[PDB]
Amino acid sequence: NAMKIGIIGAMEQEVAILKDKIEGLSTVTKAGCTFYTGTLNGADVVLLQSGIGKVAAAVGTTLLIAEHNVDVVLNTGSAGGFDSSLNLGDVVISTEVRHHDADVTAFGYEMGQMAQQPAAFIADEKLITTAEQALTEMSDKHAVRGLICTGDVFVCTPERQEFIRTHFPSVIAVEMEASAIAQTCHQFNTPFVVVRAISDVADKESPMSFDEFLPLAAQSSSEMVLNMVTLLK
Amino acid sequence: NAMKIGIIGAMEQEVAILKDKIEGLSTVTKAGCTFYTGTLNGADVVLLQSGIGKVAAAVGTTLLIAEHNVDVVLNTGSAGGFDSSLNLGDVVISTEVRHHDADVTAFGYEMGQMAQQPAAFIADEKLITTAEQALTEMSDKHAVRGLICTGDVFVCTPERQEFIRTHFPSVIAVEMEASAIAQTCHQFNTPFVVVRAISDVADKESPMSFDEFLPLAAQSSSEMVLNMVTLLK
Ligand SMILES: Nc1ncnc2cc[nH]c12
Ligand SMILES: Nc1ncnc2cc[nH]c12
Ligand SMILES: [Ca+2]
Ligand SMILES: [Ca+2]
Ligand SMILES: [Ca+2]
Ligand SMILES: [Cl-]
Ligand SMILES: [Cl-]
Ligand SMILES: [Cl-]
Ligand SMILES: [Cl-]
Ligand SMILES: [Cl-]
């Protein structure tokens, strides 16, 4: 018996680096998802390319846990930076994750809290400790640990930035899958962590420059995840 | 072999009427979802209580299709009315569904279209025909057929109604799961239809009157689904 490590990225570029390192690779496709199973430095992994956004991530995470038998989930890829200390390419590690675009305050929930869910999804303590160790193995890579907020939006306006900061002042980064991954993992009682890297600062120029910085972000976040899975073997 | 009809409702009250009609019932729970399997007037059904919101609906729909082997999906329950002809308790039938809260327009997608997804999810022609025949079997029940818009929000402010109407002028009703169910069905190439009923008109009065009319909405939409399953079996 060994841990089975799920790794989730949304986009082809976010998974390709890790894909090509897997040994004893097998491939499955289902519901628009691709699953690459094998070993990464002797760790048993299942690497999922989910697609973008909350529903795609939830579909894929569900399959990853229910059909691919993973024990923990690591979410890799790019994110939009909100913490002022971040630079492009820097790592972000989730302490917790929230939906920035959920509002059932009608019924007394706090902003971001989905009905019947906790207000925040707490990343696993052991996986955070593993992420810290993984970061030390990189060459002078800066990270920030903190709240990651997700919505079905690529944030690129000052108005949407101000809404998010009004309700989630501690937010360090935004993206489009983490809270779906985290919620699904909560429903399945599965440990998770998000270890992404910054592609942009979620401003008006960001949609145009995303593509130029995605390779950097994918490289950083992939190097984190490779170091983590090796630590977990 | 017979068609296996999946039926999805978010809340206990949305599934309770149908649950008690099932014959040869068996129950299982997974990931915060409850699945009620048996027959409804001789049709093979799997009735899912998913939970509220897009992620919960996606998790449940994924299990319903992948693990419970359903061939079609009917989404039941309550919705907030937008079309001016709708009264409390009236039925809404989806022609198509969109995410009202998705925005990746800066990458060229249209409003509401998720990246890597079609702009709208089209309800199945045969299931819509069946819904129309079910509606005729009711005693003088008014319905509107049209676009249903989903988001992770219980809509109850004029500002949010105005945003939705600005971007989706043909919307007939809003709710919190349909686009997740429909996207998941798209990904699984599974037919779907939404056949909900009106609990409120998505205004400032709607948070505190929802509960009074949820039983009415559950009654109408359950009667539609029961009529449909008899026809589809
Ligand atoms: N600005 C942004 N908004 C949402 N997701 C991402 C992912 C990278 N940049 C982002
Ligand atoms: N006003 C509303 N907004 C979202 N979903 C529902 C479901 C019933 N009424 C609704
Ligand atoms: Ca062992
Ligand atoms: Ca290789
Ligand atoms: Ca560019
Ligand atoms: Cl890509
Ligand atoms: Cl920090
Ligand atoms: Cl209920
Ligand atoms: Cl949800
Ligand atoms: Cl009509």
**Given A33, A56, A187, which is nearest B59 (Cβ)?**
A187
Q: How many helices (H) and strands (E) does chain A have?
A: 6, 10
**Given A55, A104, A114, which is nearest B58 (Cβ)?**
A55
Is A176 assigned a ligand-binding role in the annotation?
yes
| B156 vs A: CB within 8 A | yes
Q: Quote the distance between the C-alpha of residue B71 and its chain's center.
A: 16
Q: Please list, residue by residue across A147-186, b when 16 or more beta carbons sit within 10 angstroms of its beta carbon and e when fewer do.
A: bbbbbbbbbbeeebbebbeebbeebbbbbbbbbbbbbbbb
Given a contact cutoff of 8 angstroms between Cβ atoms, the answer to whether A154 and A90 are in contact is no
Cα(A17) to ligand 4 centroid in Å equals: 9
Query: What residues contact residue B99 under an 8 Å CB cut-off, 6+ apart?
Result: A152, B54, B112, B113, B114, B149, B150, B151, B179, B183
Q: Is A84 helix (H, G, I), strand (E, B) or coil?
A: coil
Q: Whose CA is nearest to atom 5 of ligand 1?
A: A175
C-alpha distances in angstroms, A6 versus A38, A43, A166, B69, B74? 11, 11, 33, 24, 32
CA distance A51 to chain B (A): 7
Residue that is written with structure tokens 């489009």 in the block: A176
Query: What residues contact residue B213 under an 8 Å CB cut-off, 6+ apart?
Result: B78, B88, B89, B198, B199, B200
Alpha-carbon span B192 to A7, nearest angstrom: 30
- Residue B177's closest chain A neighbor by CA? A55
Query: What residues contact residue B132 under an 8 Å CB cut-off, 6+ apart?
Result: B93, B145
Q: B1-233 domain in CATH 3.40.50.1580?
A: yes
Alpha-carbon span A118 to A97, nearest angstrom: 11
Q: Whose CA is nearest to atom 8 of ligand 1?
A: A79
Alpha-carbon span A97 to A112, nearest angstrom: 10
DSSP letter, residue B127: H
Could you state, in order of their start, the residue ranges of all structural domains in chain B?
1-233
Instruction: At A185, list the tokens.
Output: 């993992």
Residues of B designated catalytic: 14, 200
Strand partners, A194: A75
Given a contact cutoff of 8 angstroms between Cβ atoms, the answer to whether B208 and B96 are in contact is no
CA distance B133 to chain A (A): 31
Given a contact cutoff of 8 angstroms between Cβ atoms, the answer to whether B141 and B217 are in contact is no
Closest CA to B112 of B77, B84, B82, B147: B147
Query: What residues contact residue A62 under an 8 Å CB cut-off, 6+ apart?
Result: A184, A188, B31, B58, B59, B62, B63, B66
Alpha-carbon span B9 to B52, nearest angstrom: 9
C-alpha distances in angstroms, A28 versus A35, A68, A90, A203? 5, 10, 32, 37
What is the best residue among A175, A181, A195 to mutate for testing ligand 1's pocket, by most ligand atoms within 8 Å of CB? A175
Looking only at Cα atoms, what is the longest distance across chain A?
51
> Alpha helix (H) ranges present in B87-156?
125-137
Alpha-carbon span B33 to A51, nearest angstrom: 23
CA distance A180 to chain B (A): 6
Is B212 assigned a ligand-binding role in the annotation?
no
Query: What residues contact residue A71 under an 8 Å CB cut-off, 6+ apart?
Result: A3, A4, A5, A6, A190, A191
Given a contact cutoff of 8 angstroms between Cβ atoms, the answer to whether B91 and B223 are in contact is no
Closest CA to B70 of B221, B229, B206, B219: B229
Query: What residues contact residue A8 under an 8 Å CB cut-off, 6+ apart?
Result: A48, A50, A57, A60, A61, A64, A73, A74, A75, A76, A177, A181
Indicate whether residue B202 lines ligand 2 (CB < 6 A): yes
C-beta atoms surrounding A189 within 10 Å: 9
Strand partners, B148: B97, B173
Instruction: At B193, list the tokens.
Output: 């239809």
Given a contact cutoff of 8 angstroms between Cβ atoms, the answer to whether A220 and A14 are in contact is no
Q: Is A182 helix (H, G, I), strand (E, B) or coil?
A: helix
Given a contact cutoff of 8 angstroms between Cβ atoms, the answer to whether A160 and A101 are in contact is no
- Using DSSP bridges, classify how beta strands A91-99 and B23-30 pair: parallel, antiparallel or unpaired: unpaired
